[PDB]
Amino acid sequence: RIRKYLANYTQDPSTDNFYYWTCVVTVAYIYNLLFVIARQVFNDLIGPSSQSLCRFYNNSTTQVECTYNMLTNMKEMPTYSQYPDLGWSKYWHFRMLWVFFDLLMDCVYLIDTFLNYRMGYMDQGLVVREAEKVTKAYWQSKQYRIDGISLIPLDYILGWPIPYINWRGLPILRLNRLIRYKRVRNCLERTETRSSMPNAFRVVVVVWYIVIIIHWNACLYFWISEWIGLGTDAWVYGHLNKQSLPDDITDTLLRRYVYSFYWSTLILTTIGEVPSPVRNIEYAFVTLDLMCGVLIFATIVGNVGSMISNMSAAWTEFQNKMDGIKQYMELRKVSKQLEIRVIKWFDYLWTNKQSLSDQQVLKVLPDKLQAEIAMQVHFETLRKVRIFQDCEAGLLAELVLKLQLQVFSPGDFICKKGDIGREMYIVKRGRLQVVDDDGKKVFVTLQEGSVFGELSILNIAGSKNGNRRTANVRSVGYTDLFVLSKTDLWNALREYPDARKLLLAKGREILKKD
Amino acid sequence: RIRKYLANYTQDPSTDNFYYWTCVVTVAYIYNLLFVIARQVFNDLIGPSSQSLCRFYNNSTTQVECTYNMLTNMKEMPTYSQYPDLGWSKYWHFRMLWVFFDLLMDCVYLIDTFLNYRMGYMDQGLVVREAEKVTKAYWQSKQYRIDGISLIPLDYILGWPIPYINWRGLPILRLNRLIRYKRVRNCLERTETRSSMPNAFRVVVVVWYIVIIIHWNACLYFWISEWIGLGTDAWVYGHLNKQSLPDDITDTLLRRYVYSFYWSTLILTTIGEVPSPVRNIEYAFVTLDLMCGVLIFATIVGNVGSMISNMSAAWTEFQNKMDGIKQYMELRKVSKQLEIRVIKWFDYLWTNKQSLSDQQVLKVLPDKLQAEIAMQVHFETLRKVRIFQDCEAGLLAELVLKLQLQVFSPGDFICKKGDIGREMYIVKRGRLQVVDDDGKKVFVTLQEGSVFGELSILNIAGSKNGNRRTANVRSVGYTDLFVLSKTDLWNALREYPDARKLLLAKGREILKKD
């Protein structure tokens, strides 16, 4: 049953279902961040627990409950009288909605605590899936302290307005759900690997951080502006501030959050077009908040500057290389036709997205993975060279591991008649031809997969010709040859005696064949 | 006794007690910075030496001593009449507190002068601890000039308000204690080595510099605003500035320092929401101060941008390498299963915090320290290979100096049956197994510390097999093998003739044993 399915369960963290679970815990953490500091500071989000009483002149000035016309053009801020049961007779649907979402995110935290309990730790490469072993790995570690502080249910006791003991409600006691930050950091990292664009996702995560810090500073500004007193200064929120409440503007909860977000956006990006402070504690808060805004603006400028300089590094290294050899050509007074040819060759080098390098796979992959990336490209092409047909595959492994890439220009010759031939040519993505001394084509136009110079690698002393090419091979287009020198085949043939005997036999066969 | 303990004392600078002494001299320097410029400019810190006399209308307007109600809503600034003894009858406890802290930091400067006297200079690696030699090293150097200018006691003569000669007191003569900056630079550097995070400590030291420059500019602004005249312009401090003294704000010493700090924070971070200047000398000061604020803001932006770009260099070099070989794979049209395997291998490369490199310890350590970091890892594992048991340790030194690290993938074979075997495998943090041609396990599952291929390194010509593997070795998890080729053991065995005889003897023994 499902009880023994739970008793014999152990989660390993590398699947995609656990990654979607880390997305769910990231959603619950973002909820806990935003709406716990907003329900602490603003407190009309869970329904107003105090009736707003304005001073209204009709007859005489009486004290009556504020309508939306009494909050426009205020001469003084409305005073509050609490309800008997603190907004519970009329905002219970709001509070049951907030209690339902708090219980949903605490159920998400409970299921993440159980997945921390049956969590497969990686021992020696493989993951442990035995239940007692991951249980003792949990209890031997100190994950249960962070799982226990993040699940104290005391917000359900002392976080809602209780009318019987006249408790005003304290929703800052749900800040202990915010120390599950390792799961959100794991979800952001494992999304940053598999993303389509890592630099743009780093910038989107940085502006999500910026919106969260601006929101927390908005709640901090309205808490300080409520603790000092609303409408007592020209800096705090209220009627005496003419930016927060202008002429025909109602004072509502949306106006409070909208002006506090505008204040923290103008302070933390160092624009500062808000009213200047009046008292001393407002000067201390605005000075500390503007120094933090200078550091936040420098963080934004540094992250966007590193995002720009990371994605335009290959282009400026290309410009460094292009300017270096253009400086080398204009220092040495070369003809201009070669300069047209090399700049059109760099245009081909950009429009193929290549860099004349094998060095990235020569460096950063281990030699087994280098062997697999060698075999899944050139092995099926290098089985069809008609001398490597009946041979051992290990020699082919050492040969495909030692292939070299050369790119040619259109109209440019590879090797002329009467040249010291010591290389074998394997054509990839090109078209070669043999030409009868810049006249017509002789016999064949070598397409992709074909081979030229397989006779001048086996080193037969004087059968028909030793090592001369006896061909004028021309590239009609941009051709990407794959060349294998005589030294590499004779090293890999020095490691194989019987294959040396067999390749000498097949070479004498194909050389006495013509 | 303690007098001959002082006569035979010499301090070497590399201990931790001298580092805590440099922290004490840094504390005394920070005191001298902040409170010498604050006691010069503000001057109510040592007690007001002049009675504030407001114009108060009761009857008639009379001139009376200002209360805290007379400094709110001022129509003109209060004029000052000095005391007979200049605040000494009522602020002597404040001045004895300031004199006690000045004598405490000058005692710290005297003990640092004596530790400069008996300071052990480093001659040839070792430190000199002979007393006459460090005494002549002191007097031959010019440390005594900087120690003599930083200890003129003339602030105790002409830095306090003397009533008998009507001296107002000049606490800017204690600025000569500020040229002991080499000790503070040494303490900041030697804290920056041993810190937990060098980039964050560089940023914390930069914002300590920012708070100190903002404080010195606050004292400069209030000195210029006091020299021009308080309350004469709308730019200077006073009643005519409506930002400094608003409606219900008392003019106190805390209001002066708080508004001057707010002014220098808004100017030196180029926000500039302070009142615009009126006269010409205020325009000259605000123009120079805003150009210095542009350079300070560019310094903050440059330091935080270099802090960001230094700590995210390994990640973007990983992304350069990953994008380079992904470009190499998608240029060459490879199957997708190998692409899943290489991206999960880079996920393992990040989650082990490795980079497939020995090159950092191959480069930056000297060869003795490379030998020690070699011997304290692989020597105890390489003593247990059962052929290197009875051998000389120097050959083992040249062998552990030539070990190579290879990482494998789970399910991927190391070497199949019928392969050219020329390497010896030493397992670290992995689990290998021999499999009977992708069937069951044959005999053993090779755990950590075990060795495979120690028979195919000694090169015995035709006893049972020359150099074939005759095993299918599979990694079940991510395995970090340590491999030693035949070329490295035969180079280190070419340097040892008798060890070559002994390893041939033990190799023939273990090869005729089976």
Numbering used by the authors:
A (entry chain A), B (entry chain D): 104 to 161, 165 to 620
Sentences from the paper on this structure:
Further processing with an S6-gating ring-CNBD mask and focused 3D classification showed that indeed apo TAX-4_R421W existed not only in the closed state but also in an open state; the two structures were determined at 3.2 and 3.1 Å resolution, respectively, with C4 symmetry. The closed-state structures of apo TAX-4_R421W and apo WT TAX-4 are identical, with an r.m.s.d. of 0.50 Å when all visible amino acids are compared. The R421-E298 salt bridge is the only interaction between R421 and the transmembrane segments. The R421W mutation alters these interactions. The intrasubunit R421-Q425 hydrogen bond and R421-W456 cation-π interaction observed in the closed state are also disrupted by the R421W mutation, albeit W421 still makes van der Waals contacts with Q425 and W456.
CNG channels open when bound with cGMP and conduct Na+ and Ca2+ ions into photoreceptor cells. Cryo-EM structures of the Caenorhabditis elegans TAX-4 CNG channel carrying the analogous mutation, R421W, show that most apo channels are open.
